[PDB]
Design a protein around this nucleic acid. Structure first.
Ligand SMILES: Cc1cc2nc3c(=O)[nH]c(=O)nc-3n(C[C@H](O)[C@H](O)[C@H](O)COP(=O)(O)OP(=O)(O)OC[C@H]3O[C@@H](n4cnc5c(N)ncnc54)[C@H](O)[C@@H]3O)c2cc1C
Length: 459
DNA sequence: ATCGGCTCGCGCA
DNA sequence: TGCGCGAAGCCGAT
């Protein structure tokens, strides 16, 4: 590759081969943005060294049927804006429909690709697709970490027990890896599905319409105006956070009645904005130092340790990935009698006895983003009022992935594992049902914020 | 061959 | 509200 502000350690070879005659193809998956994208940039750099065009390919899977119209519209509306952004950079974008394992392979043959580059996800499905693609192509294949500031395989070579073991290794490498971004260079070389993306959205929304979330009077639950989608909207949210919410963040990040969070998770999850970008802007901002340490810890340690978790523990969304002490503790309490037991359907409709739990579910149903403090309480009550730890993990993941705009994310699996299974936490006083897993109480919540205001806001 | 230090609830102001 | 301890398993600095 060979260039300024392009550390070679951000890229690694999935497969070696003979470089092809054709264009460099960036298989975009996790990081759906033109700016501050190390994978797009590396793909562009390979293109310059080889005197070839860079092109972006994206696969429209049947995974959308798993979630709702809320996330399909957010992603697809974002992708319509992205096609236009990429087009201004003279970068063509190709949208394939179907299975990435077969469709990426066929595209490389059909479009005569020279080099394949993709971004990094520690999720099982991306790795499965990469394995399939490797078996179907002759060309060199590179992986670039565009999501984490320090590349996941570089920060640590093993599972990290706690944030404290991770913090020294990540912080030692931050001076090297926390750096500004080069501008994306438009295409120099002339670049050689048929449906419109609007058509795809229309066909997909008709397929999802029967199962769309409705209130009892037939009126839809989802309010689409809370987070407008796309790269342009993402940046406006980051700007208002620094301007309006970062000063109060150290004091108020755990009060759900206050709108004092970044609101960046839906854009971060789809890769509509870079975490490295957000950290650069926050570092430079003159703000309360307590707020800066609190927020940088969240977007650097906690977000990037969630990738460490999924990358070194392939069963990240199961019981086995919990630490020994936690699995041992939860196992001993499997027979304990739950105070309540709710089904997925009762949980989903917000019909528990706990008005605070119900309000947290209604914030999830109506806005698509539950406040970060109540997500801890929400997941820990699923554990407390479920038949088993496995049923709890299953119900929390089902509701999180169906209804959160930021769901189906390593942060989600690491966050749920912390809450239910103690991952990256320590043991606490033993209790019935939840054992030594950290406990959170309705009364504890009453002490810390105006619980009644939150409940009133969400019926 | 031994210890300091890690993202709650509670009792106290 | 803000503070110090309790209950608690283990990592790694020494
Ligand atoms: C049960 C549970 C489920 C969760 N599910 C998800 C999910 O599906 N998707 C998701 O992106 N996050 C998830 N989180 C982490 C966190 O709640 C959200 O990222 C955060 O509330 C998003 O809102 P924000 O971006 O306004 O938060 P901010 O406070 O502004 O945080 C900014 C960023 O810091 C990172 N961050 C903050 N808290 C955490 C954390 N605990 N772990 C990892 N990264 C963190 C995120 O990237 C987040 O976007 C979950 C946490 C819990 C306890």
């Amino acid at each position: 590759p060979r260039g300024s502000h392009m550390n070679p350690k951000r890229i690694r070879a999935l497969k070696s081969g003979k470089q092809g005659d054709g264009p460099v193809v960036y298989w975009m998956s996790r990081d759906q943005r033109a700016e501050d994208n190390w994978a797009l940039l590396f793909s562009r750099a390979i293109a310059k060294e080889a005197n070839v065009p860079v092109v972006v390919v994206f696969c429209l899977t049947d995974e959308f049927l798993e979630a709702g119209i809320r996330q399909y519209e957010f992603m697809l509306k974002g992708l319509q804006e992205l096609e236009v952004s990429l087009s201004r950079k003279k970068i063509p974008s190709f949208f394939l429909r179907g299975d990435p394992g077969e469709k990426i392979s066929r595209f490389v043959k059909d479009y005569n690709a020279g080099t394949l580059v993709t971004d990094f996800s520690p999720l099982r499905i991306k790795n499965q697709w990469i394995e399939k693609v490797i078996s179907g192509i002759s060309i060199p294949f590179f992986e670039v970490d565009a999501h984490n500031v320090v590349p996941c395989w570089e920060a640590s070579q093993k599972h990290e027990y706690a944030a404290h073991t991770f913090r020294p290794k990540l912080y030692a490498l931050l001076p090297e890896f926390l750096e500004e971004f080069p501008e994306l260079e438009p295409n120099s070389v002339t670049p050689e599905m048929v449906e419109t993306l609007s058509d795809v959205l229309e066909t997909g929304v008709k397929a999802l319409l029967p199962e769309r979330a409705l209130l009892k009077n037939k009126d839809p639950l989802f309010e689409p105006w809370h987070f407008e989608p796309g790269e342009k909207a993402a940046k406006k949210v980051m700007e208002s956070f620094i301007a309006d919410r970062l000063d109060s963040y150290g004091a108020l990040r755990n009060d759900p009645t206050k709108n004092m969070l970044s609101n960046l998770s839906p854009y971060l999850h789809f890769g509509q904005i870079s975490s490295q970008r957000v950290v650069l802007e926050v570092e430079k901002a003159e703000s309360n130092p307590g707020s800066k340490k609190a927020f940088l810890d969240e977007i650097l340690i906690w977000k990037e340790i969630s990738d460490n978790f999924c990358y070194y523990n392939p069963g990240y969304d199961g019981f086995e990935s919990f630490p020994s002490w936690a699995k041992e503790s939860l196992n001993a309490h499997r027979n304990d009698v739950r105070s309540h037991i709710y089904t997925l359907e009762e949980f989903e409709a917000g019909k528990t006895h706990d008005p605070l739990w119900n309000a947290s579910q209604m914030e999830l149903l109506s806005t698509g983003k539950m406040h970060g403090y109540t997500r801890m309480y929400w997941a820990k009550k699923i554990l407390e009022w479920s038949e088993s730890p496995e049923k709890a993990l299953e119900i929390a993941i089902c509701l999180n992935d169906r209804y959160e705009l930021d769901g189906r994310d390593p942060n989600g699996y690491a966050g749920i594992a912390w809450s239910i299974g103690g991952v990256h936490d320590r043991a606490w006083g033993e209790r019935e049902v939840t054992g030594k897993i950290r406990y959170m109480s309705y009364e504890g919540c009453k002490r810390k914020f105006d619980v009644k205001l939150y409940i009133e806001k969400y019926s």
